[model samples]
Target: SSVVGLHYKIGKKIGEGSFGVIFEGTNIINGVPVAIKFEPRKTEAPQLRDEYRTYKHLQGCDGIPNAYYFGQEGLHNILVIDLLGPSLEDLFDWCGRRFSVKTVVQVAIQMLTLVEEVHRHDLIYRDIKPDNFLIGRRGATDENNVHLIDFGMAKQYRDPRTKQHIPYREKKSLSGTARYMSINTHLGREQSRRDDLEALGHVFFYFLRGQLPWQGLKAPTNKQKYEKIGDKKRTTPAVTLCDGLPQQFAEYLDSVRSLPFDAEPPYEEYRMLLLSVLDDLGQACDGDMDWMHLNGGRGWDATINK
Candidate 1:
């Protein structure tokens, strides 16, 4: 018989990643569609537990995929999550080179909001690349929803008596994709909220251009070199990577890059900065008539002017 209490009939593989294979499945009781990720046991049980806790903490947050259950099914450890839309990587492939500025801004805003929610819970999402973001249906709505997934590398930020948000460091491992890694992360520095924000900055640029800043370079080799040489020699600014990107967005990226490795900027500042980039890009798209507004007229600027 199929695995008992698995609740879903595992169908063909929908996708596979470093962690495990995801299969399309259905809830036996409610007949709701879902995705089941069969993850093999790894050396890091603590990390797996942390990821499970993080997902539980983030349930119901906009732009985050919901976890239905997590446990061992036979010999495999599994995570039952909501079935999602296409990955951003797939979306980029379908749309061809470069997304509309409006689409990029909308995605960026949603992602930033997701990041804000995760950070508020004192958890750091060490990975924030395009592949981890899913475009799905918004529960019974006609519009597409953006959901952030893959929290395997996530960890909590703790403040001891000194009042500093210190990250827990263990063995050295590649916490995230090399192409979008912040300078500090590339140098094997402790992962922190700042690193997460910097990676998001890289991702915003990627969505706009449909390419990573260091796409031309061989990632494996570059990662090795950075691992050896460290941040002083490996940092690449967003403006330097892509021309024609707006000055304001590029400046915000630069600011994120410049933040000290140990410091997490005030949340309000980062929120406003991301919103400013979204507003500017949205207006640019409207002015060019590149994207049509459903309600007509230009979009509203919801950012706080500083």
Candidate 2:
């Protein structure tokens, strides 16, 4: 049935995110649009159920999506939530595959804040790639906001009752996209607070340079390809990778990499570093993005902004 949960009507398919099939849906009772994700019950590594729990804990946090409903219907686990706009990956292509320092830093500040919020909630978003951070839908008051989505790989890094951090372990299987994963992640080390930040650095560099050094490495098998990417990532130092860009980017990678496995990250310090870069560029954020100014706000919807 196109109708779901007696209150939502599923519409056209919008996206096939890493774990689920997402459809643009309508809330029949309120006339509001929502995103509905469906994961088949037989999937080997089901995440919709666990991700639903993570959403519950993050209910009051800004920059996190509003999860509306989660229920099993016949053959799938369904999750409905706020529908968002283009991903950073989509915008990157629209802007000719290059982002100004201002855009990247603006994104950095918001991402750092959001990541910290997730950390504060005691969950580490294991996958921090560009696709996971999306700008809010146009025609909405929150259009300028960047929302973090996809909790399939999220993990609790500490014991809530005892405040005990997860013990550092090695030989762990990788948990994120290879290109943006931290070196420690490639080396089979368990992820923690710092690893998430380290991946953010890679995302920043990727935007600035349009590619990372390991993007083209090839091997016969998927595992071998990951190994090759990891090998290249470990060999290329942050300084070398961030050369010609802002020095702060290099410093960010180093800062994140040096944190003890279980220690709290200095989120504010990272934000300050990014803000400092923004200042040096002589630009104020003012909540404007590159896409807005490009092509006279090509896809920007003015219906709700005014």
Candidate 3:
């Protein structure tokens, strides 16, 4: 029996990540589309289980995929979630790596709101990047509404008893995508909510500039490239990171850099900074993005059942 309260068919394989393989499926009874993930590793079961719980907790929240079912399929653990559209990474490539200023602000503000929602759950999303965030059919108002997916790297960063944030100690190992990891992550310090926002700051820079300053750095291997990126993140000033962009980008970076290990990030301030950037560029939120308007509103649709 399917754990989703209905039978479903795995139409075709959709995606595979470090954790498991995923497929596009549809409920046999209702024909409702769903994405299924299968994890066979004992080491990964806990993360899979935790992802279910996190998704369960986040149900009914906008920009979050609905967790339909979780169960064991033979020796493998299975997860069913709402099918979402192609990721931002895919869009970045599809649209030639450049998002307009209006679209960039729209993306930043939405991510800021989503991160704030996740922070309310007391868990920190250690990973924040283009590939992990999906563009999905989320609302009637917005065409490019995005979602933060892949909570497997998330960690509890607060103490339930004290309610204050836990300290950032060493030795958990790096837990996020190297390209977006915060400076503290490279230092081997534990991550907090602040780290997530700092990572978002990097993401914002990536979206606005379409390429990080570290992109062209000379490196023999990916590992060396990550190290060089980390070095630049540590030594380079915020202004350098914000070069050729608006000053608000620098403000966003500096604001995140100034946060203490346990301090709750000023999400409103960070969001407003982007809004200010939008204003400076004479753009409005206005319910549209670069790909949506600039490219005639047609993009990759992730719900096509094969």
Candidate 4:
């Protein structure tokens, strides 16, 4: 595919998705770097169009990767975007086990900001796992810079009769990873802004605790995993997992664990609740020595150079 007018030359492959392959690229005109996601011809045109629309809607949004150009190129649909840094999954793997409380709080804040922006635009990011968050340059002045990428599952919220803005919902089709799915999503209910927020909550807990709230024998198939999750309660008790976590943070996790799998709160209220939880985590990590020291001696005070 030719990206001639776009001022970029494709280079090595950086990542691959269900419908596309992303590559490291360089802008020939400005000498800036970028990533080009190329959807193969086998991908449905409607899905590619949806991805294009999502990027268009999300342009200029803070904490989201900027979509530079998207169009058909021969046998592929190409999307030009800013080169992202390491993924949150990679960051966790690099650090080994859990991240420091300060680091976790910073990442959570960044993700929440991104979710807030998407909700404001009447969009819900159906996928909110660690793999979608990209860390910026390591030595950059703004070390906390993170970009939320991959809006392929996003959709516009609209009223049925009036065609006015209503709320975002998860599509009926199977989408998103099951591991970090929100309770509502697992139940095949409508995907809402709250779902994304809740999923982020799960991701935060995973990074902080170094383990999922529930982990069982590996299912041989996706069907088994889905069935197992379906048969389980929405809020699984995590009291045992809270031994090293701060009381405030543990309480927040408990609240999440208490939610029914089918529960779906309205967007604004959900946003407020999530912000409160995040604030609690921030305060707990900032002030309490015990809460801040959960990350194997890499506490909040130490990380902030206090």
Top candidate when judged by lDDT against the true structure: 2
Model with the higher lDDT, candidate 1 or 2: 2
lDDT scores of the candidates, listed in order? 0.66, 0.86, 0.80, 0.65
Estimate the Cα RMSD of every predicted model relative to the unseen true structure: 7.3, 3.0, 3.0, 6.2
> Cα deviation in Å at residue 113, candidate 2?
0.8
Q: Residue 144's C-alpha lDDT in candidate 2?
A: 63
* Candidate 4 lDDT over residue span 1-306, tens digit each: 445335889888876857567788899989878888777676445466577677777888877767778777777777787886767786676566677666676566667778878877767788888988876643554334667887878876544345465543444655688767777777677766566766776787788788774556357897677657644435564455456764444555456545543344343444354446546564543322132243565522324331
**Could you give candidate 3's per-residue lDDT for residues 1-306 as a string of tens digits?**
444335767868777878688888887778767888988846524678889999988888888888988887677788888887778887877667877777788888999999999988788888888888887654534337888889998877876566778765886665567878898887778888888888888988888778877667878986677778889888878888788888887888888878998888989988888899877778778767666633345544444311
Regions more than 4 Å wrong, model 1: 3-6, 41-49, 159-164, 167-173, 218-236, 266-271, 274-306
Tens-digit lDDT track of model 2 for 140-171: 88886788998888999998778889988898
The CA lDDT at 252 in model 3 is 86
Q: Across residues 1-306, which tens digit of lDDT does each residue of candidate 1 receive?
A: 444245776766887867677788888888877888776665445344556667788887877767777777666677777787666665665555466666776666667777878877777888878888876643434135567888878776754234567755645666667767777777567887778877877777776777754564433685565564343225655567557776656766777778765675665666566557656654542222122231243321113110
Clashing pairs in 2: none
| Model 4 TM-score (2 dp) | 0.77
TM-score of each: 0.78, 0.94, 0.90, 0.77
Q: Which stretches of candidate 2 lie over 4 Å from their true place?
A: 300-306
